[PDB]
Design a protein around this ligand. Structure first.
Ligand code: HEM
Length: 382
């Protein structure tokens, strides 16, 4: 198999695959067959190809499992095509305009500074547990309007569902149940007494109840793991590239423009959401049968030397315009401006506060995954 070693060395396998097998039939972790696509042109076109459906009603009967969810949560943007997708995305997109997100800038900054306050002046931390993880989940709580007194429960429910322990799935199942009950109650509360928050705004245009519920769940889960690991991956990348770290420490005004190249170089999503051809589709010379499972590799596309010369180099001078880390076409990340704001703010606050930031260890601690590029821990000194 040209894809041997994919779990251990994704980027090395992608280099082999683009040259030898750029649309390659693999076995996924559950052993169901899927098509892995590694070339930039094929991934970009695929993301925008309306014949590649996100709706699993288009999946070959018997061919696709995925995850186990109450059917209210099937009404979600990343299991949906036009016109349904077009309708819901328009309503919620109001929330994430460059200006509505920009107003969160001071509160995001306040949250990040309160997390670093807990580190003191010198010592050691796991930056994932102390900084990269809590920041995005606080921001999501503030955006949705999760009352402060519920946040300890909310965090305890959310953690287990971010990479569910595949040997002990009971905690992850009781987490989904708990959040459904929680969100049902919170929506009722806001319906009876509107507050200044996203869920109160979504209730107003109420959007079926299932659709509201699906937006609460998808904004939570799309908004959490990816943001944690864009931040974490960017810190590791900086601490591994001293000349780049120096460039940013010196001229912090460059951070916003550098976010693009962090995402191209070490974005958190190796793979897009699975897609299903609505009929037989040719992708880079390979006819993929209708209803089969297509995995477009965003990371493989972003490291394609035919689009990004010297792809394995972190270059804050690079034109990273056209990277696919936040997707492309009608499902382009709803959170993109808030993803950008959180990364800018987190990195600027950390660099300003900890001028002696260094890695504690010779080696990163990578989470083994076909779909996620992320760290189990990021031990640093300061
Ligand atoms: C506050 C943070 C975030 C929120 C609330 C958020 C929310 C969402 C939502 C709702 C979608 C689905 C849009 C649709 O189907 O119409 C989406 C898509 C996506 N997001 Fe985000 N996101 C965030 C951060 C990130 C980050 C940091 C990354 C990666 C760097 C990312 C990568 C993606 C990708 C690749 C897609 C498209 C998936 C596909 O087409 O298969 N997101 N996001």
């Amino acid at each position: 198999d040209p894809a041997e070693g994919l779990l251990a060395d994704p980027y090395a396998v992608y280099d082999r695959l683009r040259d030898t097998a750029p649309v390659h039939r693999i076995a996924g972790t559950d052993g169901k067959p899927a098509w892995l696509v590694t070339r930039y042109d094929d991934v970009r076109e695929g993301l925008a190809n309306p014949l590649l459906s996100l709706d699993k009603k288009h999946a070959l009967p018997g061919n696709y499992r995925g995850l186990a969810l109450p059917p209210a949560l099937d009404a979600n943007l990343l299991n949906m095509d036009a016109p349904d997708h077009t309708r819901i995305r328009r309503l919620v997109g109001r929330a994430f305009t460059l200006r509505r997100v920009e107003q969160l800038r001071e509160p995001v900054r306040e949250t990040a500074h309160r997390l670093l306050d807990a580190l003191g002046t010198h010592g050691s931390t796991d930056l994932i547990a102390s900084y990269a993880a809590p920041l995005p989940i606080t921001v999501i709580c503030d955006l949705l309007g999760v009352p402060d007194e519920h946040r300890r429960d909310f965090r305890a429910w959310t953690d287990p569902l971010v990479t569910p322990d595949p040997a002990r799935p009971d905690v992850a199942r009781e987490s989904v149940v708990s959040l459904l009950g929680f969100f049902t109650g919170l929506l009722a509360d806001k319906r009876k007494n509107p507050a200044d928050d996203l869920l109160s705004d979504l209730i107003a245009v109420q959007l079926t109840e299932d659709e509201l519920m699906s937006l609460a769940f998808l904004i939570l889960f799309a908004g959490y793991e990816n943001t944690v690991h864009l931040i974490g991956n960017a810190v590791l990348a900086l601490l591994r590239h001293p000349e780049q770290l120096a460039a940013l420490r010196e001229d912090p005004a460059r951070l916003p423009d550098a976010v693009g190249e962090f995402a191209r170089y070490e974005g958190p999503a190796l793979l897009a959401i699975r897609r299903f051809p609505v009929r037989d589709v040719t992708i880079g010379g390979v006819t993929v049968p209708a209803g089969e499972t297509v995995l477009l590799s965003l990371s493989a596309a972003n490291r394609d030397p035919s689009r990004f010369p010297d792809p394995d180099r972190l270059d804050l001078g690079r034109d990273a315009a056209g990277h696919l880390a936040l997707g492309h076409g009608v499902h382009y990340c709803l959170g993109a401006p808030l993803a950008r704001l959180e990364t800018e703010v987190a990195l600027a606050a950390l660099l300003e506060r900890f001028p002696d930031l260094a890695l504690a260890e010779t080696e990163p601690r990578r989470r083994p995954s076909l779909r996620a590029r992320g760290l189990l821990a990021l031990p640093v000194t300061y």
